[PDB]
Design an enzyme around this catalytic site. Structure first.
Site, mmCIF file in Angstrom:
data_model
loop_
_atom_site.group_PDB
_atom_site.id
_atom_site.type_symbol
_atom_site.label_atom_id
_atom_site.label_comp_id
_atom_site.label_asym_id
_atom_site.label_seq_id
_atom_site.Cartn_x
_atom_site.Cartn_y
_atom_site.Cartn_z
ATOM 1 N N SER A 153 25.028 61.929 75.046
ATOM 2 C CA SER A 153 24.125 62.945 74.489
ATOM 3 C C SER A 153 24.585 64.401 74.534
ATOM 4 C CB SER A 153 22.702 62.867 75.012
ATOM 5 O OG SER A 153 22.231 61.534 75.046
ATOM 6 N N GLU A 203 31.991 56.505 74.839
ATOM 7 C CA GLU A 203 30.527 56.435 74.756
ATOM 8 C C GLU A 203 29.849 55.927 76.008
ATOM 9 O OE1 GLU A 203 29.960 53.399 71.729
ATOM 10 O OE2 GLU A 203 28.452 55.027 71.208
ATOM 11 N N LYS A 231 24.957 58.292 61.356
ATOM 12 C CA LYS A 231 24.492 56.954 61.614
ATOM 13 C C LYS A 231 23.672 56.541 60.436
ATOM 14 C CE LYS A 231 24.042 57.407 66.652
ATOM 15 N NZ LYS A 231 23.076 57.681 67.753
ATOM 16 N N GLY A 269 20.016 55.823 75.909
ATOM 17 C CA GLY A 269 18.794 55.100 75.696
ATOM 18 C C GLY A 269 18.299 54.299 76.881
ATOM 19 N N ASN A 312 27.849 62.230 63.758
ATOM 20 C CA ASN A 312 27.634 60.899 63.271
ATOM 21 C C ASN A 312 26.250 60.997 62.677
ATOM 22 O OD1 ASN A 312 27.631 57.968 62.805
ATOM 23 N ND2 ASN A 312 27.941 57.558 65.059
ATOM 24 N N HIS A 316 32.029 51.577 67.431
ATOM 25 C CA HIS A 316 30.702 52.012 67.801
ATOM 26 C C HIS A 316 29.766 51.044 68.484
ATOM 27 C CE1 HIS A 316 27.195 54.242 67.961
ATOM 28 N NE2 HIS A 316 27.756 55.280 67.333
ATOM 29 N N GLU A 357 26.632 51.026 68.695
ATOM 30 C CA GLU A 357 25.528 50.380 68.042
ATOM 31 C C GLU A 357 25.953 49.077 67.393
ATOM 32 O OE1 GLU A 357 24.386 53.825 65.961
ATOM 33 O OE2 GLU A 357 23.351 54.595 67.836
HETATM 34 O O1 LIG Z 1 25.534 56.584 69.594
HETATM 35 C C1 LIG Z 1 26.051 57.599 70.043
HETATM 36 C C2 LIG Z 1 25.516 58.211 71.309
HETATM 37 C C3 LIG Z 1 24.280 58.972 70.829
HETATM 38 C C4 LIG Z 1 23.353 59.570 71.910
HETATM 39 P P1 LIG Z 1 22.084 60.658 71.227
HETATM 40 O O2 LIG Z 1 21.429 60.103 69.949
HETATM 41 O O3 LIG Z 1 21.020 60.826 72.325
HETATM 42 O O4 LIG Z 1 22.695 62.021 70.874
HETATM 43 N N1 LIG Z 1 27.078 58.240 69.490
HETATM 44 O O5 LIG Z 1 27.720 57.810 68.317
#
Ligand SMILES: O=C(CCCP(=O)([O-])[O-])NO
Lengths: 249, 249
Positions: free
Chosen positions: B212, B166, B12, B172, B10, B94, B96
């Site tokens: 993560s 997720e 993002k 975070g 992703n 997602h 976010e």
């Molecule tokens: O939003 C996410 C989780 C990301 C965690 P990080 O940025 O620590 O790899 N996945 O779409």
């Protein structure tokens, strides 16, 4: 006199590759004799396309939205990403976004400011809904919105700012804003500028029309002393767009 | 033993024409031998670049979002636009977006149906927050979310759906998620479907881990039963993503 008119095309969340080239072709092959600024606001997805194909000298590509800073915003496009992509104009505050994507006075204000500091050329939207118009809250509404944007800007910033007055009260309400009604509203805004910022800023300011625009009614509108151009929706998808350009008399 | 793994990047809200091409080129020259589906999720702005640059056969591009229908939703990018765009994959749901952009279950499940209904492969996201988790509402929270998606799909539909678990509570907030941690939410998922849908689908289901992931812990994670690949963030804009892909056997 008036400043340099802007006829902007808000293609919104529409089109297909074919439909666009086609459009853009018409556009590119159109001689615009006067001083006007043509803007094209296409989908993120079709930003590359347009970009590579718009050849005309009077036209500009413009995003229909953005967010201030790049990061974890799954789904979102930030200012930097756009700059880089080579995009320097934006449309912020658009009616459909306040209404449906909860982009509040402060949100708009905050992106506006940001667009500006990144050296963006912003068309900011404002306007009252039927309800508010009805309960004669127009001026609180209109004014409030504009100062929200102001608060954040410096006097040098306005040079980058295009205000677009969206009579949301007519957009899809079987309500027809007349030139008289537009003019009274752009008039207000300018009053609020001349006074709050400067009479210099105000006179140089371009204030576009947001309601429903189309060939017949483009002419009469712009003739109004306070209307500096158009924020076009629907006809921006058809060839009347050219007709709307030319109303920039 | 396991259905086909997926390695989804992703991006993002990040990128650059120059840094992205660097990556793509690395991705492109990677040697993969197994049966995997690599999936690059870019910003709408970067679709064309990634679309016509990414050469690799074990790789396809996805959109990080959309709306089910074209029209007046400024700022928005719909199913049909991408469909004609040549984009068949899409991240939807997602964290976010569920967190800052109004994405209710009711919202994500329509989105999801619409994509399926359109022929997209989907990475519908689901997962609970630290608030839930702690107050012991995890099963309540993830079956409900999954259920709301299911409500509109048809069993045949699931041939077109991928789930990505997720770990919101660990994303975070200062907490970590062990694999046995993942496994459990994964297994709940597998369960419900297996139980409310049919173990035919179930064992077919690809359930991704959206927490993560990195070059170091990808294998010890991939090493768990219900873990079918990943939905990667940070390590995705970096080379170590290659390690992620290999980490799927
Ligand atoms: O939003 C996410 C989780 C990301 C965690 P990080 O940025 O620590 O790899 N996945 O779409």
């Amino acid at each position: 006199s008036k400043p340099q008119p802007i006829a902007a095309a808000n293609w919104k969340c529409n089109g297909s590759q074919q439909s666009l080239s086609e459009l853009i072709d018409l556009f590119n092959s159109t001689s615009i004799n006067h001083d006007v600024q043509c803007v094209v606001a296409s989908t993120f997805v079709h930003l590359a396309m347009t970009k590579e194909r718009l050849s005309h000298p009077k036209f500009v590509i413009a995003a229909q939205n953005a967010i201030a800073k790049s990061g974890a915003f799954t789904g979102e496009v930030s200012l930097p990403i756009l700059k880089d992509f080579g995009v320097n104009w934006i449309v912020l505050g658009h009616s459909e976004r306040r209404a449906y994507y909860g982009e509040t006075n402060e949100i708009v204000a905050d992106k506006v400011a940001a667009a500006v500091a990144s050296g963006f050329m912003v068309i900011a939207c404002i306007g009252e809904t039927l309800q508010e118009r009805e309960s004669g809250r127009t001026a609180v509404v209109v004014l409030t919105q504009i100062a929200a944007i102001a608060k954040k800007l410096k006097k040098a910033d306005w040079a980058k700012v295009v205000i677009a007055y969206e009579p949301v009260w007519a957009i899809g309400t079987g309500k027809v804003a007349t030139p008289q009604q537009a003019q009274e509203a752009h008039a207000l805004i300018r009053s609020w500028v001349s006074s709050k910022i400067g009479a210099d800023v105000r006179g140089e300011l371009r204030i576009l029309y947001g309601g429903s625009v189309n060939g017949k009614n483009a002419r009469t509108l712009y003739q109004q002393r306070d209307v500096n151009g158009f924020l076009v929706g629907g006809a921006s998808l058809k060839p009347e767009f050219v007709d709307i350009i030319k109303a920039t008399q």
